[PDB]
């Protein structure tokens, strides 16, 4: 079911897909405790709980320190890091125009997860392909 | 202008007969370039599409 809310764009580095939310909360323990900035929280009063920005005050004009805690925490792309946004792999690159009617003719026709996961899992490893993963040590500060 | 029968093969050398293979592949370029340019051109739209990279991965991977 589609969350009544709409992806906020407005951080340059980072985006919030509602309907990708699965409340798990691990980005809200992540600020609060881990970050220690205490930006995120969840609204569990609201009809459709839903990741909230200081009182649901867009990212940009909140208190985001943009440290990128949330986005590591997330366990699916909810909360994900804009540079990853139609380039991690092949089938990504297509305009979200095309690609929404995409996904509702595959949902219609599709079997079981198993089969269609594993093409998924096809896909994610053809990505090895393109993408390389480098071990680094921040050139910012001594931490 | 007496009788005579022996012939005298031409010394066509190693580059020499090379450059004379070469030459007839670049002469069949030349005679195809209207389909190569065409080729390219779709090979490079291949690629603009993702279609070249989905199969570079398809195999590499
Ligand atoms: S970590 Fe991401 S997916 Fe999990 S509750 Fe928070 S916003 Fe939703
Ligand atoms: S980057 Fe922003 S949303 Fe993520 S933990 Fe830091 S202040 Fe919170």
Partial sequence: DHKPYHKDESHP???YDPDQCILCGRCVEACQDVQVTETLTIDWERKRPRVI???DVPINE???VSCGH??????????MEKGMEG??????????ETLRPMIEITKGVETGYGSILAISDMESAMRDERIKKTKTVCTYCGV | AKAIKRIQKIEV?????????????????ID???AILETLHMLGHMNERGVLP???????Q
Wanted: proline share 2%; net charge negative.
């Fill in chain 1, 70 to 79: 949330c986005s590591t925490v997330c366990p699916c792309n909810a909360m």
């Fill in chain 2, 13 to 29: 050398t190693e580059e020499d007969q090379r450059k004379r293979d070469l030459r007839e592949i670049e002469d069949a370029l």
């Fill in chain 1, 13 to 15: 580095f980072y985006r």
């Fill in chain 1, 62 to 64: 909140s208190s985001c």
């Fill in chain 2, 54 to 60: 989905l199969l570079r991965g398809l195999f590499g």
């Fill in chain 1, 87 to 96: 380039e991690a792999g092949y089938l990504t690159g297509i305009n979200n």
């Fill in chain 2, 32 to 34: 195809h370039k209207e």
């Fill in chain 1, 53 to 55: 920005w200081d009182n």
